[model samples]
Target: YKDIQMTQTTSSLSASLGDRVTVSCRASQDIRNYLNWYQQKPDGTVKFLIYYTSRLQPGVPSRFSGSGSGTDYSLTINNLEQEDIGTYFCQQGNTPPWTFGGGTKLEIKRVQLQQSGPELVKPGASVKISCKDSGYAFNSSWMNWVKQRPGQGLEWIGRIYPGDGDSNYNGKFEGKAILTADKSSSTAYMQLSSLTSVDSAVYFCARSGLLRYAMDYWGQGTSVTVSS
Candidate 1:
């Protein structure tokens, strides 16, 4: 079985204001059409683009779209414009380490200009990652999840007691991704499926690295929330 793991970070990826761009990834296994997409704003706000292949998350607008099959996937924004400029990322939801793709920042030149810019979040504000451990006896080993927010960089979002189903989050993300797990049938899930406007964040799930190389990770960014 292949598990997916992703590292988080934002970067600049220039694409024409109206061209279709397909973000790609080179994986070690056939993720089985399991991937997620997300677009984030400079202010740390994020939008959900796609999940579980090309399925759009709730309120995602029409201009935003995704398409792909099997090990290869792509996100296409039709008639992309200034308002569509921002950071974009692809994630693998197939398995643990729930990996996130290196992000592609979108800019519309004269149309979309950078604002005052975002500040590095408070030194200790916690960011949350909802981890779902499946296929293995969670407690038989250990559950590890991580987060990489705009300003704060990458930090361990804390592990959960899937056996006991207990978890911890950095105080900063006080109300984000309340961590939970299960070991009985070997399926641990992190709910936030609600996809609320505030839940527009990128996240990942992963298994422990043997000694140093923590292999097998997947991430499908659950950006954009379900807003009424």
Candidate 2:
């Protein structure tokens, strides 16, 4: 019953440096406090510009702002800079199967992971999953993995850099998961060992840029069901 539909699937806005620009996203039903916006750079990385309807992610420029709620939402960038000349996307976090918009192309039209689960492995088994980067430079950005169980919200699992293999994992995932990448093929991999029924969930790989811990672009998601 949760279907998020963006009114303007795509559009182009032309403004010089130091101008005001606005992009919008509309949902089919009342989503209340579950809306977010992102900017996709030319490099194939995404920056979390806004979250929770109107709150700016940490370190986001004040010039970049957001507003609206319920079924309507918008992201406005004030004093738009040359660096902001990329695509924009709107997402909904109010319901399961979190969804994103078709994306908006500005001035110049711009353009924009994960795993198999719901699988039954023995009580003690290992799974190697990977997120292949089809766009953008692999080593320049950070790769992240998220987890969500049935009827739950998204949870951060871990992150890694494709360039040098520098990585970070959530306290809960430490020792439970390993994050690695193959820079040559532009791919990131995550291995979850010692699988248990509690680990059954849908896992997603996303690209993060500019803002630490903020995910901009997400994968279609893989379902992992751990059952004996």
Candidate 3:
């Protein structure tokens, strides 16, 4: 049920010291107190903010707390302040090559209004976008998905396995997106929810091992333009 080399990539981020933020982590097995959470700073440098599920790193503020049972866990920060802004990640320590969720980019949004996307369909058929990896070995690993906005590089959405056809999706993508793969072909597939001009972007899918290893490798991104 676990990819020894394919670590986790579904960590979460949130504000600290002001608002109640929920950060999540997932594991292939029931990880009993074998998980950690970290804060990823700018410039691609990751800082250990919390560890052992709830133990705050030295010098880290007391506002951050984590609690969970088995493989389900979360990080919560109280009194979220402006200075507490940064990406958050969930990490696993129960095994080798520990894994961290793809990162969740944290930014103060203007107006705080959530925009709901419209229902879209490619008429009656769906558009299948393929993400392929190059310059790396294919098998014995898992494929992952990340969403990118204007400024941030990538936000952890969820991940899937090409070898077993298993997947996990972020609540944000409930019905709008689909992630799947074919191990026999060494390819990852992403299907965007309904089609609209706004659903345009250059989406990238890559392979990562579960060993807290770096995504030192990635696939050439695929660009899709939706038009009527």
By lDDT, the best candidate is 2
Q: How accurate is candidate 3 locally (lDDT)?
A: 0.57
What TM-score, to 2 decimals, does candidate 3 have?
Answer: 0.44
**Candidate 1 local Cα displacement, residue 83, angstroms:** 2.3
Each candidate: how many clashes? 31, 7, 24
By TM-score, the candidates rank as: 2, 1, 3
Q: Per-residue lDDT tens digits of candidate 1, residues 88-157?
A: 7776656554556667777765401011211222222333333444444456544545555554333344
TM-score of each: 0.50, 0.54, 0.44
TM-score-wise, the better of 1 and 3 is 1
For residues 12-74, could you state the per-residue lDDT of candidate 2 as single tens digits?
566677778889788888888678887756654456778788888778889988888788888
lDDT of each: 0.52, 0.72, 0.57
Q: Which 10 consecutive residues of model 2 have the lowest summed lDDT?
A: 108-117
Instruction: Give the per-residue lDDT of model 3 (tens digit) for 1-228.
Output: 233221334433433446766666666677667666656455333455766677776788888798876777778777777756777767665654345565566655550111122223343345667765543455556665545443333444567766667777656564767887666656667777666655555555545565633332344444555556
In terms of lDDT, model 1 sits at: 0.52
Model 1, residue 148: C-alpha shift (Å): 1.7
Candidate 2 lDDT? 0.72
CA lDDT, candidate 3, residue 31 = 67
- Model 2 misplaced stretches (Cα beyond 4 Å): 1-118
Candidate 3 least-lDDT 10 residues: 111-120
